[PDB]
Amino acid sequence: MQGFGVHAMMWSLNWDHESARRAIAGAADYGQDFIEIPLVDLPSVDTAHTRALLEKYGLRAACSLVLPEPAWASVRPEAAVAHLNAALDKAAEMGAEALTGVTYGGTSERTGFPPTQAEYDNLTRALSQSAGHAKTLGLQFGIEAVNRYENHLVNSAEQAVALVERIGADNIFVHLDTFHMNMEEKGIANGIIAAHDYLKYMHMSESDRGTPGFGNVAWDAVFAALAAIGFKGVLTLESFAAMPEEMAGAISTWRPVASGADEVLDKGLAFLRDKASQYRIFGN
Amino acid sequence: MQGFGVHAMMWSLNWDHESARRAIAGAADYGQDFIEIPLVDLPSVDTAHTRALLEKYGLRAACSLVLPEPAWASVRPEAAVAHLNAALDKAAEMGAEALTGVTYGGTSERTGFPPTQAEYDNLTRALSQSAGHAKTLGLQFGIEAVNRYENHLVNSAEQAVALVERIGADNIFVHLDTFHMNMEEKGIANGIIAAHDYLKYMHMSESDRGTPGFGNVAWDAVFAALAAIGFKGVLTLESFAAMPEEMAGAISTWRPVASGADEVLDKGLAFLRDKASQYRIFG
Amino acid sequence: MQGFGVHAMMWSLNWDHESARRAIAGAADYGQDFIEIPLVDLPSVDTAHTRALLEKYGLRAACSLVLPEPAWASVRPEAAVAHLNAALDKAAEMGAEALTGVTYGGTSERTGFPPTQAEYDNLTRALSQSAGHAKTLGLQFGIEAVNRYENHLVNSAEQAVALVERIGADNIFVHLDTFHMNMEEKGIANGIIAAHDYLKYMHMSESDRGTPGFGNVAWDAVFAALAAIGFKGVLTLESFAAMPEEMAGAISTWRPVASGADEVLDKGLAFLRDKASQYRIFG
Amino acid sequence: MQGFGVHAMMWSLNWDHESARRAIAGAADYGQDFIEIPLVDLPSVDTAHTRALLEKYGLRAACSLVLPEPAWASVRPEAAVAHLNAALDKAAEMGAEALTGVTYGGTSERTGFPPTQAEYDNLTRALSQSAGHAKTLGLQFGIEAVNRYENHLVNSAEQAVALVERIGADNIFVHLDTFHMNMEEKGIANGIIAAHDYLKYMHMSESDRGTPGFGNVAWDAVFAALAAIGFKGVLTLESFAAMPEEMAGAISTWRPVASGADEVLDKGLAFLRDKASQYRIF
Ligand SMILES: O=C(CO)[C@H](O)[C@H](O)[C@H](O)CO
Ligand SMILES: O=C(CO)[C@H](O)[C@H](O)[C@H](O)CO
Ligand SMILES: O=C(CO)[C@H](O)[C@H](O)[C@H](O)CO
Ligand SMILES: O=C(CO)[C@H](O)[C@H](O)[C@H](O)CO
Ligand SMILES: [Mg+2]
Ligand SMILES: [Mg+2]
Ligand SMILES: [Mg+2]
Ligand SMILES: [Mg+2]
C-alpha cells in the first residue's frame, strides 16, 4: 500500500449505497490513491456495490474501525476476534487491502488504571488470531495508536511497536495519527522514528482535527522523519470538518473544527501533496 | 499577580502539613514568585499553617481546583457556588490572591452532546456569584480552558473570553494552558491573542505533560504572543512528573511523562525563564 | 497603505511599457491590492504609462529601490538625496503611495567595520531631507532592514526603529523582510514586536527566496506577532523565482529558488492570504 | 568521530600557548568530547604543545579552516593543495582526527556568476589530491557547505554530496551548519536527509550565531533528521559570542550576537545535550 489517501469521513461515516458513491467518487475527484472506508455497522455494508464503485473510479481502499465496547479485546478477546474477523471478511469482499484503526479496543476505553499485562495478553491473543485470519485473505492488519483520553493501552508508537513485536505476525503494521502524536510523542518525529519498520499508514490530521497546515502539528518534523525513514506507506487525511452534530459524543468534538469539508479537501489535500513533494516522499 | 509560578503537584497533590512544607520550600528553592496550591479536600487543609509558611518562605500563592461532580456548575449551579465559596474562603485564609483552574466544571465532565445555552446560563449565574464572593475577599477568579476530552464547556480561549464577558465581573481572568491549547487553538498563539484583555495566568505545560521545551508546543509562538499582547500575569509550570501511580485515572495518565520531577524542575523552569528573557516578558 | 501586495519581480525587474502591463495585469489577475514597482534606473520609467494601467486594473502601487553605490547615504548623503528625490518624483508621477526598500544604502554595502555614528548622521541627514520631499508629494517613505551580508547599517528591526526615531519624520515607516529577519532577529517575532509603532510594510519571503510555506520561516510566529500588534500595512510577496540568470550577482542567487514564478504566485500568494485569515490580520 | 564538540572560537581564534590552554581547558570544563581548532596562522601553532593539552584533558580534536584568497581552489588549485596539505600536516601533528570547514574556498568568495564546471573541475582536482594526503596521515577530510553570501560553490547539502561523490575518496565527509542551512535548505532537515551517506559533522549554530535554542533554527526538525538517518558523527556548537569587535569584517558580524560567551556555553551546550538525549542521538 503506497500513496495518498482520504478518509471517507470527509463526506460521511455512513456507508449506504449513495454514501459509498459520494465518498468514492469524491476521492476520485481529488486524485487520491486510497480511500479509507469506515466499518461501523458491518451488517449494513454492501461489499458488492462498494467493490463495483471502487473499480469504476480506479480507487484502492483500506478499511478502518473502532472496536465497539462488547468487543473490546482487553476485556473480551473472544468477541474481539469475532468482530474483527467479520470486518476482515467485509473488507476482503470489498476489495480493500487492509483493516486498520483502533482494532484493539475503543476510543472511549478506560479502566481508570494503567494497562495491565493481563490486558495485554488479551490483546495479544485476540490480535494474533484476527491477523492470522487477515493473512488467509491476503490482508494486512493495522494497529493505530490514539491519545491517553481515548484508550489506556496503545498511546505511543513505542507501545504500538512492542505490541506488534509481541504478536509476532508478519502482516501487522503500525498506524500513526498526527492528531494523537501531537500529545503522546515527546517530539512528534520520535513516534515516526520509533515505528520506522512497522509504519505503513499515517493519519495526517491537524492538531484540532481541522485543516492540515493551519494548526499546531510540526509538519516539517513529520515529513522530515517520514522521508528519512524511507516511508512508502499511505498518507491519509483525517479531519472532522464534515462530522455531523449527531456524532459529537462518539468523537468528543463539541464545536466546529473547520469552516467546511470542501475547504479542508482543497487546502488540506494540496498541503499534504506539496509537503510530500518538498520532502520527496515516494521519490525513490 | 505577576511573575513565575510552579504548581505544587511537582511535589504532591496532597496538602497536609508535611506536603505543604515540602511544596512551599521547594518553590522557594527554585526562586519562584508563586506556588499554585490545589484545593482537593477543603476540611483537610490547615490554612493558617499554609499562610505562615508562605510568609516564612516569602512566597505568593494562587489556589486552583477542579469542581467535584456533585458541584458541576453546568447542571448543579447552586452546589457549584457553595463549593467555590468555601474554596475561596480557604484561599483567602491562606493569603492566596486568586482561585483558578477548572472552576466551572470537571476534568472528566461530558454530556455526550455539545454545550447548551441552559448549561452556559448555569455557568454564568454560578460564576457571577462566586466571583462576587471572591471580590468581597480581595481575590481574583480564574477560568481555565481545558481540552475537549476533559470538559465540553470551555475549550478555546474564545469560549473563555465569551463566558468572562457574559459574567461581566471586573475580577475574573482567563487562564490558558499550553497543553490544552496545543489541541484546542487553531495555532496556539491565536488563543493568547483572543484572550488579550483578560489573560492573566498561564499553565506552561509541555504537550505530553513532561518538560517544557521538549515536546510539541510551539513555545516561540506562545512567548511572542505573550510579549506582543503585553502580558503581565503569572507563568506557572504544570507537569505530571511527580504524579503517583494512584493518580492515573484522575489525570488520564497511564505512563511516565518524564524521568522525574527534579529534572522537569531544573530544565523546565529554566527553559521558561530563558524564553521569557528572550521575549522580554515583564520587561 | 493596506492589504496584499506582490513585487513586480515575479514577472520582471524591467519596467518598460509591456513589462509594466504584464506585471500590473498579473498582480491584478491574482487579486492583489498592491504591486511593488522597482526603480532601477529612473530615466527608463514611463510614469504616464504606468498610472494608466494602475487605474485600468484597479491596482495601487508602492515603489522600491536600492541605492546605487554613487548615492550610498552612508558616505555620500547629498548624492543620496538627489537619487531618492528623483525616484520620489517618478513614484509620485505614476501614482505610487510610497517609496521603500534599501533607501539608505546598498545590498552589497560594507566597510569591514561596524556602523559608526558619523555614518548614521549622514543617513539621518539624507533620509530627513528626502522624507520631507516625499511628504510634500503625499508619499510615505520606507526603510527596509536587510541581513548583515548586504549592509552593515540597518539589520535588525531595533536598528530600523531607532533610525526612524532619530529622523523624527511622521511619514517614515519600518519595512521588514522575513528572509532577512530569519537571520537578523533573535526569534523572528521579536522583530515585528520591536517595530510595532512603525511597521507598515512586510516582505513575506521564504528563507531561501522560494515559496512562502516551503522553507524555514516560522510563519505562525510571524503572523501571530502581526495580529497581536494590530498590523495594518501591506503584506507583499518577495520571491526570486523569476529572476534571470543574469541577475545572479546582483542578488547573490547562484541556483534555482523554486520551479517557476507561476507556482510561487499560485501557492505563495494563497498561503499568505490563508495565514492572514487564520490569524485575522485584516478581518 | 562521534560526540559533542565546541568550536575554540568560544574562547578565541588565536592559538598561542595561553589561548590554546584557555580553549582546551574550557572545552574540558564543559564535558565535551571534541574541540574544533581553527587553523589560520600556521607557523604560530605549537603542535607539540596542543597535542599535549589535548591528551592531558582527554579531549579529541578536529581542525577547521577557511582557505585564504591566494589559495582558493576554484581558481588556484595548486595553491589550494599546498595550503591544505600544510594544514593537514599541522592537524595530524596536533592529534586531530580530521580537517574540515570551508576547505575548498573562502567565506568572502564571489565570482558574480553561478558556479561553473571549470571551477568544479578545479575543486575536484585539488580536493582529491589533498584528501589523498589526509589519508596517508590517518585523517578524514570535511567539506562544509556555507550560505550564498560567503561562497557560490558549495551552498546546499546536495552540492556538497555531488562534489564528495565526484572526488570518490574514502575519507571525505559532508559537514553541515544549521546557521547556513537555515537559509540554503528548503526545509532545513532536507539538507541532513540529502547528505545522509556522508554527514559526519555538524555545526550546531543558531540562526543569528547566538545561542542554540533561542532563534529561528527549527531544532526539532534538525534532530529528527539526524536521529532518523542514524547520524553518528560530531555535534559542534558554533557561536560568535566571544568574537572581538576587530573580527567584524572577517565574519560580517556588526553587532553582538548574544550577551556573552559564558551564557552561550552554559545554555547552548545544555540545550544541545538535552535535545540529543530527547532524540536518542547517541
Ligand atoms: O483517529 C482515530 C480516532 O481516534 C482513528 O483513526 C479512528 O479509526 C477514526 O475514527 C477513523 O476510523
Ligand atoms: O490543566 C489542568 C487539568 O486539565 C488543571 O489546570 C490542573 O490539573 C488543575 O486545575 C489544578 O488544580
Ligand atoms: O530584499 C531586498 C534586498 O535584500 C529589498 O526588498 C529589495 O528592494 C529587493 O531585493 C528588490 O531590489
Ligand atoms: O561556518 C563557518 C563560516 O561560515 C565555518 O564553520 C568556518 O570555517 C569557521 O570559522 C570554522 O573555522
Ligand atoms: Mg486516526
Ligand atoms: Mg492546567
Ligand atoms: Mg525585501
Ligand atoms: Mg560553520
Q: Greatest interface and its residue counts? A: A-B, 37 and 36 residues
What is the global morphology of chain A? globular
Strand content of chain A: 15-25%
Structural class label of chain A: alpha/beta
Tell me the radius of gyration of chain A: 17 Å
Helix content of chain A: 40-55%
**SS summary, helix count of chain A:** 10
User: Strands of the biggest beta sheet of chain A: in what spatial order?
Assistant: 1-2-3-4-5-6-7-8
Describe this protein's structure.
The structure is a homotetramer. Chain A is α/β, with parallel strands linked by helices and 284 residues long. Chain A has one domain. Helix content of chain A is 42%, strand content 15%. Chain A contains ten helices and eight strands. Chain A has an eight-stranded parallel beta barrel with strand order 1-2-3-4-5-6-7-8, surrounded by seven helices. Chains in contact: A-B, A-C, A-D, B-C, B-D, C-D. At the A-B interface, α6 of A face α6 of B. One D-psicose binds next to β3 and β4 of chain D.
Question: How would you summarize what this structure contains?
Answer:
The structure is a homotetramer. The first copy, chain A, has 284 residues and is of the alpha/beta class.
